[PDB]
Amino acid sequence: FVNQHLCGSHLVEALYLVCGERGFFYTPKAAKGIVEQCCTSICSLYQLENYCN
Amino acid sequence: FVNQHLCGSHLVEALYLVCGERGFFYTPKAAKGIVEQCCTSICSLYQLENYCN
C-alpha cells in the first residue's frame, strides 16, 4: 500500500498505518515535503517514515 | 462528525477534514493529548484545531 501515488486521505491513511503509536506530522504545504514525495511522485516506506514522530 | 468519540483512523480522518491544507500533527502517546481529549472522551472542533499546523 505504500509503493504508489498517495494523496489526501489516502496519504494520511498510509502515515497512520506505517507510523503506528509513534504518530506523525502531515504538512502538505511544505516545499518539496510529503506531497511532492508521495502524492505527485511515487511514495516509499522510507519516505513515509521521515514523517513519523 | 467532530462531536463524538474518535479513535485511530477515525480521529486521523477528522484532523484531515478539519485542518485542510494547514495539515496537522497526530501524537497519540502525548499525555493528556489528543487520545484523552478525543478518543476516550468526546472530541470537539475546538480541540481538534489545537492539532492543526
Side-chain angles (χ1 to χ4, degrees):
Chain A
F1 60 107
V2 297
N3 299 116
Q4 64 189 108
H5 298 268
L6 293 175
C7 309
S9 66
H10 298 200
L11 175 53
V12 156
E13 155 172 309
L15 285 160
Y16 170 74
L17 287 180
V18 163
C19 301
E21 300 275 53
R22 316 127 67 174
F24 59 86
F25 61 97
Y26 174 61
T27 307
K29 79 220 179 273
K32 303 189 75 271
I34 194 178
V35 173
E36 191 193 274
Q37 292 316 306
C38 286
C39 175
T40 84
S41 35
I42 306 191
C43 200
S44 67
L45 174 60
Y46 183 104
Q47 285 139 287
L48 279 170
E49 284 203 327
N50 285 330
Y51 301 97
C52 306
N53 293 309
Chain B
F1 60 107
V2 297
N3 299 116
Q4 64 189 108
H5 298 268
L6 293 175
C7 309
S9 66
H10 298 200
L11 175 53
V12 156
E13 155 172 309
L15 285 160
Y16 170 74
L17 287 180
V18 163
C19 301
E21 300 275 53
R22 316 127 67 174
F24 59 86
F25 61 97
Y26 174 61
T27 307
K29 79 220 179 273
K32 303 189 75 271
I34 194 178
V35 173
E36 191 193 274
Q37 292 316 306
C38 286
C39 175
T40 84
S41 35
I42 306 191
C43 200
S44 67
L45 174 60
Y46 183 104
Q47 285 139 287
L48 279 170
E49 284 203 327
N50 285 330
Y51 301 97
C52 306
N53 293 309

Short mmCIF file of all heavy atoms in Angstrom, two decimals, chain B residues 19-46:
data_model
loop_
_atom_site.label_atom_id
_atom_site.label_comp_id
_atom_site.label_asym_id
_atom_site.label_seq_id
_atom_site.Cartn_x
_atom_site.Cartn_y
_atom_site.Cartn_z
N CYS B 19 -8.44 20.27 9.45
CA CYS B 19 -7.26 21.09 9.27
C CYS B 19 -6.98 21.44 7.82
O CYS B 19 -6.27 22.42 7.56
CB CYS B 19 -6.03 20.39 9.88
SG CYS B 19 -6.23 20.07 11.63
N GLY B 20 -7.51 20.66 6.87
CA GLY B 20 -7.36 21.03 5.47
C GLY B 20 -5.90 21.18 5.08
O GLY B 20 -5.04 20.41 5.51
N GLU B 21 -5.61 22.22 4.29
CA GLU B 21 -4.26 22.42 3.76
C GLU B 21 -3.25 22.84 4.83
O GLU B 21 -2.04 22.79 4.56
CB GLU B 21 -4.31 23.47 2.65
CG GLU B 21 -5.21 23.10 1.48
CD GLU B 21 -4.51 22.22 0.44
OE1 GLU B 21 -3.93 21.17 0.81
OE2 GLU B 21 -4.54 22.59 -0.75
N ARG B 22 -3.69 23.27 6.01
CA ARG B 22 -2.74 23.52 7.09
C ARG B 22 -2.05 22.23 7.56
O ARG B 22 -0.95 22.30 8.11
CB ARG B 22 -3.44 24.22 8.27
CG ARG B 22 -4.38 25.37 7.89
CD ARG B 22 -5.79 25.22 8.51
NE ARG B 22 -5.83 25.34 9.96
CZ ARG B 22 -6.94 25.36 10.69
NH1 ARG B 22 -8.12 25.11 10.16
NH2 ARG B 22 -6.85 25.62 12.00
N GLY B 23 -2.64 21.06 7.34
CA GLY B 23 -2.09 19.85 7.90
C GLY B 23 -2.19 19.84 9.42
O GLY B 23 -2.79 20.72 10.03
N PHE B 24 -1.58 18.83 10.04
CA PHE B 24 -1.77 18.62 11.47
C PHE B 24 -0.65 17.73 11.99
O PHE B 24 0.15 17.19 11.22
CB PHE B 24 -3.14 17.98 11.76
CG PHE B 24 -3.36 16.65 11.08
CD1 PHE B 24 -2.92 15.46 11.66
CD2 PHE B 24 -3.99 16.59 9.84
CE1 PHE B 24 -3.10 14.23 11.01
CE2 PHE B 24 -4.18 15.38 9.19
CZ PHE B 24 -3.73 14.18 9.78
N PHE B 25 -0.62 17.56 13.31
CA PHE B 25 0.22 16.55 13.92
C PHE B 25 -0.64 15.64 14.79
O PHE B 25 -1.57 16.09 15.46
CB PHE B 25 1.38 17.16 14.74
CG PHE B 25 0.94 18.04 15.88
CD1 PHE B 25 0.88 17.53 17.17
CD2 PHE B 25 0.65 19.38 15.67
CE1 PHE B 25 0.51 18.34 18.24
CE2 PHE B 25 0.27 20.20 16.73
CZ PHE B 25 0.20 19.68 18.01
N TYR B 26 -0.35 14.34 14.70
CA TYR B 26 -1.08 13.29 15.40
C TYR B 26 -0.07 12.63 16.33
O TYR B 26 0.86 11.95 15.86
CB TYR B 26 -1.69 12.29 14.42
CG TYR B 26 -2.35 11.09 15.08
CD1 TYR B 26 -3.42 11.26 15.94
CD2 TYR B 26 -1.91 9.80 14.81
CE1 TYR B 26 -4.03 10.18 16.56
CE2 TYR B 26 -2.53 8.69 15.43
CZ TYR B 26 -3.58 8.89 16.30
OH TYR B 26 -4.21 7.82 16.92
N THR B 27 -0.22 12.85 17.63
CA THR B 27 0.75 12.41 18.63
C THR B 27 -0.02 11.66 19.71
O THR B 27 -0.35 12.23 20.76
CB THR B 27 1.53 13.59 19.22
OG1 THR B 27 2.10 14.36 18.16
CG2 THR B 27 2.65 13.10 20.13
N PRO B 28 -0.33 10.38 19.47
CA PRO B 28 -1.26 9.67 20.37
C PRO B 28 -0.66 9.32 21.72
O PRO B 28 -1.43 9.06 22.66
CB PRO B 28 -1.62 8.40 19.57
CG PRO B 28 -0.46 8.21 18.59
CD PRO B 28 0.03 9.60 18.27
N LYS B 29 0.66 9.31 21.87
CA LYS B 29 1.26 8.98 23.16
C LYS B 29 1.45 10.20 24.05
O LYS B 29 1.96 10.06 25.16
CB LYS B 29 2.60 8.26 22.96
CG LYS B 29 3.78 9.19 22.63
CD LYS B 29 4.71 8.61 21.56
CE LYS B 29 5.86 9.57 21.24
NZ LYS B 29 5.50 10.56 20.17
N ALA B 30 1.04 11.39 23.61
CA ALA B 30 1.23 12.59 24.42
C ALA B 30 0.26 12.57 25.58
O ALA B 30 -0.96 12.48 25.38
CB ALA B 30 1.06 13.85 23.58
N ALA B 31 0.80 12.65 26.80
CA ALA B 31 -0.03 12.58 28.00
C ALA B 31 -1.07 13.68 27.96
O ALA B 31 -0.76 14.83 27.66
CB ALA B 31 0.84 12.70 29.25
N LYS B 32 -2.33 13.29 28.21
CA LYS B 32 -3.48 14.19 28.16
C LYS B 32 -3.62 14.88 26.79
O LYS B 32 -4.35 15.88 26.67
CB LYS B 32 -3.44 15.22 29.29
CG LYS B 32 -3.36 14.59 30.69
CD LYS B 32 -3.53 15.62 31.81
CE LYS B 32 -4.98 16.08 31.97
NZ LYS B 32 -5.31 17.25 31.10
N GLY B 33 -2.94 14.36 25.76
CA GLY B 33 -3.08 14.89 24.42
C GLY B 33 -4.36 14.47 23.72
O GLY B 33 -5.42 14.36 24.34
N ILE B 34 -4.27 14.19 22.41
CA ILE B 34 -5.49 14.07 21.62
C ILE B 34 -6.26 12.80 21.95
O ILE B 34 -7.50 12.79 21.88
CB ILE B 34 -5.15 14.16 20.11
CG1 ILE B 34 -6.43 14.37 19.30
CG2 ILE B 34 -4.33 12.94 19.66
CD1 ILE B 34 -6.19 14.51 17.82
N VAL B 35 -5.58 11.73 22.35
CA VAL B 35 -6.30 10.49 22.62
C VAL B 35 -7.25 10.68 23.79
O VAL B 35 -8.45 10.36 23.70
CB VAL B 35 -5.32 9.33 22.88
CG1 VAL B 35 -6.10 8.09 23.33
CG2 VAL B 35 -4.55 9.04 21.63
N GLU B 36 -6.75 11.24 24.90
CA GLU B 36 -7.60 11.51 26.04
C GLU B 36 -8.70 12.50 25.68
O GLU B 36 -9.84 12.37 26.15
CB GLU B 36 -6.77 12.06 27.20
CG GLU B 36 -7.53 12.12 28.52
CD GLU B 36 -6.81 12.96 29.57
OE1 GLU B 36 -5.95 12.38 30.28
OE2 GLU B 36 -7.11 14.17 29.71
N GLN B 37 -8.39 13.49 24.85
CA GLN B 37 -9.37 14.54 24.59
C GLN B 37 -10.42 14.14 23.55
O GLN B 37 -11.56 14.62 23.62
CB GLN B 37 -8.66 15.83 24.17
CG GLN B 37 -7.84 16.46 25.30
CD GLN B 37 -8.62 16.47 26.62
OE1 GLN B 37 -9.75 16.97 26.68
NE2 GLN B 37 -8.04 15.90 27.67
N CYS B 38 -10.08 13.28 22.59
CA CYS B 38 -11.00 12.98 21.51
C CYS B 38 -11.38 11.51 21.39
O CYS B 38 -12.43 11.22 20.81
CB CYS B 38 -10.41 13.46 20.17
SG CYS B 38 -10.51 15.27 20.06
N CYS B 39 -10.57 10.59 21.91
CA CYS B 39 -10.86 9.15 21.82
C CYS B 39 -11.52 8.62 23.09
O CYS B 39 -12.61 8.05 23.02
CB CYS B 39 -9.57 8.38 21.49
SG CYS B 39 -9.75 6.58 21.49
N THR B 40 -10.88 8.80 24.25
CA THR B 40 -11.50 8.33 25.49
C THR B 40 -12.59 9.26 26.01
O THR B 40 -13.40 8.84 26.84
CB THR B 40 -10.46 8.12 26.60
OG1 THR B 40 -10.20 9.37 27.25
CG2 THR B 40 -9.19 7.60 26.03
N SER B 41 -12.64 10.51 25.56
CA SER B 41 -13.79 11.37 25.82
C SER B 41 -14.23 12.00 24.51
O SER B 41 -13.56 11.87 23.48
CB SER B 41 -13.49 12.46 26.87
OG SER B 41 -12.15 12.91 26.76
N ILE B 42 -15.36 12.69 24.56
CA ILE B 42 -15.94 13.22 23.33
C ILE B 42 -15.10 14.37 22.83
O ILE B 42 -14.70 15.27 23.59
CB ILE B 42 -17.40 13.64 23.53
CG1 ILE B 42 -18.22 12.49 24.12
CG2 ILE B 42 -18.00 14.23 22.22
CD1 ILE B 42 -19.72 12.75 24.11
N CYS B 43 -14.81 14.34 21.53
CA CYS B 43 -14.00 15.31 20.83
C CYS B 43 -14.80 16.58 20.57
O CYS B 43 -16.03 16.62 20.70
CB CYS B 43 -13.50 14.70 19.52
SG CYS B 43 -12.06 15.52 18.79
N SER B 44 -14.09 17.64 20.19
CA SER B 44 -14.74 18.86 19.72
C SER B 44 -13.89 19.49 18.63
O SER B 44 -12.68 19.25 18.53
CB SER B 44 -14.96 19.84 20.88
OG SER B 44 -13.71 20.31 21.35
N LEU B 45 -14.55 20.28 17.78
CA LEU B 45 -13.82 21.07 16.79
C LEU B 45 -12.77 21.95 17.46
O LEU B 45 -11.63 22.07 16.97
CB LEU B 45 -14.80 21.93 15.98
CG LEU B 45 -14.21 22.93 14.98
CD1 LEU B 45 -13.37 22.23 13.91
CD2 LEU B 45 -15.30 23.76 14.34
N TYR B 46 -13.13 22.60 18.56
CA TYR B 46 -12.16 23.43 19.28
C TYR B 46 -10.88 22.65 19.57
O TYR B 46 -9.77 23.12 19.31
CB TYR B 46 -12.80 23.97 20.57
CG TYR B 46 -11.87 24.90 21.34
CD1 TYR B 46 -12.06 26.28 21.32
CD2 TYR B 46 -10.78 24.40 22.06
CE1 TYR B 46 -11.19 27.13 21.99
CE2 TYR B 46 -9.91 25.24 22.73
CZ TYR B 46 -10.12 26.60 22.69
OH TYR B 46 -9.27 27.44 23.38
#
